[PDB]
Design a protein around this ligand. Sequence first.
Ligand SMILES: *C[C@@]1(O)C[C@@](O)(C(=O)O)C[C@@H](O)[C@@H]1O
Ligand SMILES: *C[C@@]1(O)C[C@@](O)(C(=O)O)C[C@@H](O)[C@@H]1O
Ligand SMILES: [Cl-]
Ligand SMILES: [Cl-]
Ligand SMILES: [Cl-]
Ligand SMILES: [Cl-]
Ligand code: NA
Ligand code: NA
Ligand code: NA
Ligand code: NA
Lengths: 250, 250
Amino acid sequence: TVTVKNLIIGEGMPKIIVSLMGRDINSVKAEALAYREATFDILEWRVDHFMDIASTQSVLTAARVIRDAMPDIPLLFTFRSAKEGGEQTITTQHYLTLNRAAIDSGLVDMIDLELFTGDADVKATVDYAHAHNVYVVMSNHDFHQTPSAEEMVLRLRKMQALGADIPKIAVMPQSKHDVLTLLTATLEMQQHYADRPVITMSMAKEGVISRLAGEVFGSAATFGAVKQASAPGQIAVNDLRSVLMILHNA
Amino acid sequence: TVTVKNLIIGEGMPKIIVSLMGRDINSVKAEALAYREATFDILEWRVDHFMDIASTQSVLTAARVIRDAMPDIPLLFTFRSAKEGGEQTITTQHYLTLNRAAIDSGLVDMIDLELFTGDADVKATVDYAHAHNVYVVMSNHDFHQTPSAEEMVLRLRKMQALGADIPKIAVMPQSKHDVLTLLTATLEMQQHYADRPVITMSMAKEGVISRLAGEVFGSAATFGAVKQASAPGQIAVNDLRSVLMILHNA
Ligand SMILES: *C[C@@]1(O)C[C@@](O)(C(=O)O)C[C@@H](O)[C@@H]1O
Ligand SMILES: *C[C@@]1(O)C[C@@](O)(C(=O)O)C[C@@H](O)[C@@H]1O
Ligand SMILES: [Cl-]
Ligand SMILES: [Cl-]
Ligand SMILES: [Cl-]
Ligand SMILES: [Cl-]
Ligand code: NA
Ligand code: NA
Ligand code: NA
Ligand code: NA
């Protein structure tokens, strides 16, 4: 299990993550004040929505505003690359720097690190995170299609081999079969290969059941929406909690 | 679609069935009065819980009490055999007679008919039902294990070939894989072979997601509990409705 800021990820009900999206420092603050009136387990800051990413200082100041608003929340720092469905382009060097500066700031509890950034850079960044008691959600997204169950399982296995604390994969179904494929990979991963918590989701309307069935098939967390979704398929956070509770207590 | 007593089965959200269980005429009445203060789509009377099954008249009087309490509800008459997880033994002849008398009484809208009763008797009973504008939920249960997806699909295909209006299968998982197998059979049936609505469920705690994911994978109805479950895995009917509504509107 990963106990991150006094949340035990990998036990009990899947943990609810919400994504804060603000274009500037003022909107980040306003969003943090609104989010702290919702109930969820982990706050993801979607850094790629922030316009002034060119300044490491500006990014760190925004992280501090969030942390000041929610002193006790598990805080996940996520720059989603345009490659993997995020809002803007960034150089590899600047991406890694933003993450390292978030790590050594003491403001964040976890970073998201995209698997396909490159093995050497991944290893260096994972080691830096761990040296500062920061956990790594190592991630992969396919916003267009669903790989085979075999491919997804090997992808998640590689994340473990590279030191991910929590492997994560989000894929887009093009069919109902694709949703079942994602559930199948999740269960195979959890039963035969995982040695740590894993997060999986099938996106869009069609994939919604994957955001609900984490407890049965082995996804440790799931994303809900406070007002606006950060990815297709996310449902209102109160409704998500209601369903997770019903499944947990059945 | 099967529109039965002004309910369109096979469209929209999966329909909620609850099972009324009473040992005698007085308890059947009391249960009917309690059930009509719950919200659901179809009332199943579990005839095999009734003690005085030896008298066709007694069974018909009980059906009338239910119908008198709920004049407009779609009413499904179900004697579940001990073979398939019901409460008591019955001869084939008496089983078929109870069903035929329920059919020609005008009191019921549907009967449950177990596939493995025997082909000739199934055909005769299906024809009798249809001659009286009664629909047939043709059913199979395995309370101990989950057949292969291939076996389940061929079983449901056979039900269609024998004139079932709604094929139905309920199986017991012995693993999480078994739950996925049931979902896989459901989706394959609905996408490649069904030409009418089908009901599927994986029983027990482990199978609960199957009672929730009918809209995505192709199960037309699902069972909830008013106070007491008629089979393992059924959840409270208000909670079931809440989840189905959340999935429908996502
Ligand atoms: C992990 C993640 O990519 C997945 C997400 O795309 C989802 O589909 O919920 C939301 C996004 O904010 C998150 O970073
Ligand atoms: C259809 C049916 O056998 C299935 C059931 O066993 C279930 O698992 O919900 C309930 C039972 O009453 C019903 O007849
Ligand atoms: Cl807080
Ligand atoms: Cl397996
Ligand atoms: Cl009524
Ligand atoms: Cl298929
Ligand atoms: Na550094
Ligand atoms: Na491995
Ligand atoms: Na007759
Ligand atoms: Na067929």
